[model samples]
Target: LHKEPATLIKAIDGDTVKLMYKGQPMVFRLLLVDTPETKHPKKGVEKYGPEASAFTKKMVENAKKIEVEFDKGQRTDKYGRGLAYIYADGKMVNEALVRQGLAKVAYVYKPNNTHEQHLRKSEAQAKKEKLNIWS
Candidate 1:
């Protein structure tokens, strides 16, 4: 998939982020990796949720440039939030979070498996090393 340049408006949470693409503002749910919930009323401040959110904020806020890529399958979900793979500078933020073990690889759906293998590989290593959530 091709990537398009975007600007981060805010890192809403570990798995959700808002950005300005072209002209309009967009909020996307990071594909494949699911971090702990930092703002769920029911789940409310899950363990490691704050850390995951902080990690995302640090990466996105510090990135000189951000790019977003859509999977070949579906683009937006029922919630109307775009589902995407994000890159900070050049590193894939989705995989980075999984590799760090601050997130777990979940939400495997339809043809959206574009980067699933790569993400799963990182998650395996993180699990084996027992990092963050894996611990």
Candidate 2:
């Protein structure tokens, strides 16, 4: 449980980001959510893959003093990186992405989602509005 203040240096895709925390390079996986992959050819790409990635990148680029929250489920995935929830300016970055239609709520394994209802509502609104990623 290493806690540190960081800056969002880059977004690799929807689920991954590179941060500079305490002058060290840190990678994070947004917990309890997954978005379309930008690099998988077999995934065949989603409608707003690039837009989502670009949107995430823009949202976090050069963002300073980002906060990393760790949960009991914090563990390295197969790729070996810390999993965390990112916050900036007291706002959950992952949830914001979903609400903005830049990402989707992906339920894998157990559905222990506290934010399920809100995510669904946001997704529905994005669909209704035909937002970029939803479109």
Candidate 3:
């Protein structure tokens, strides 16, 4: 997908978010960031899932607006969700999630592999601190 401006319509969870793109609703799955599953249904909520979700919600709300950017990754998944790097102000939402210890670096598929190194560093720092998800 190409670059575009967006707004946070909803935070499905820490990693999945609903966005409004040019007045149309779109689903954006944050690239390279994986948070606990809050809606596993049969599996129920995973550890720290709700906390991660809440943190994401607050993070989204904190931003005045968001921007969706694509960089050498799978543009969308089978479900038609955009795999993008979300930015609020100037910071990437995906990176923020990991840096805050709410998510881990995951789903490192190539082409979209741009953020792996950055995310891994954030994850390492968070994990070392035993913050939130790590705890």
Candidate 4:
């Protein structure tokens, strides 16, 4: 895993984000999950779409020097952006989304997951609670 410091500028969805690091723009992929689109015509809105966005914005907006950690798996999806787990104040923002049921764990590649077990346990807890977006 590679770690770098960044400032999160926007949470595009529960799974995607935009960040600024040293005046350069960077995009990050949440390592293990997908969330419902807030603006998909057919899908309507995800249960906690607004809340998820709000939560991420609260955590990241105007924050200083957060850490981003990348998994060993495919670094980018088809879009050629960096895939990462964003961290702030020792909190894993990606997992935080799942724990709040704002996202679901999505294992795209089989062999390269560094946080699969953590993802599973977090997902189980979210399932048990039926938190936020899950309802």
Best by TM-score: 1
lDDT of 3 by residue, 5-99 (tens): 89888889878899998798989888888888788787778887898888778878899768899878568899999889988876788898898
Which candidate would rank higher by lDDT, 1 or 3? Answer: 1
Cα lDDT computed for each candidate against the true fold: 0.93, 0.71, 0.84, 0.75
Clashing pairs in 4: none
lDDT string, candidate 2, 69-100, tens digits = 76555355677666676776566777877877
CA shift of 121, model 1, Å: 0.7
Poorest 10 consecutive residues by lDDT, candidate 2: 108-117
Write the residue-wise lDDT of candidate 1 on 1-135 in tens digits: 999999999999999999998888988999998899889998799999999999999999999999999999998989989899999999999999999999998979979998998998999999999999888
**Using alpha carbons, what is the TM-score of model 1?**
0.97
> Taking the tens digit of each residue's C-alpha lDDT, what string does model 4 give over 14-66?
56788886588877777777776675687677667777777776776645658
Cα lDDT of candidate 4 equals 0.75
Model 1, residue pairs in steric clash: none
Clashes in each model (backbone N, CA, C under 3 Å)?
0, 0, 2, 0
The pairs that clash in candidate 3 are 72-111, 73-112
Count clashing pairs, candidate 1.
Answer: 0
Candidate 2, RMSD to the unseen true structure: 3.0
Give me the overall lDDT of model 2: 0.71
Each prediction's TM-score versus the true structure: 0.97, 0.76, 0.90, 0.84
**Which of candidates 1 and 2 is the stronger one according to TM-score?**
1
| lDDT of prediction 3 | 0.84
Output the TM-score of candidate 2. Answer: 0.76
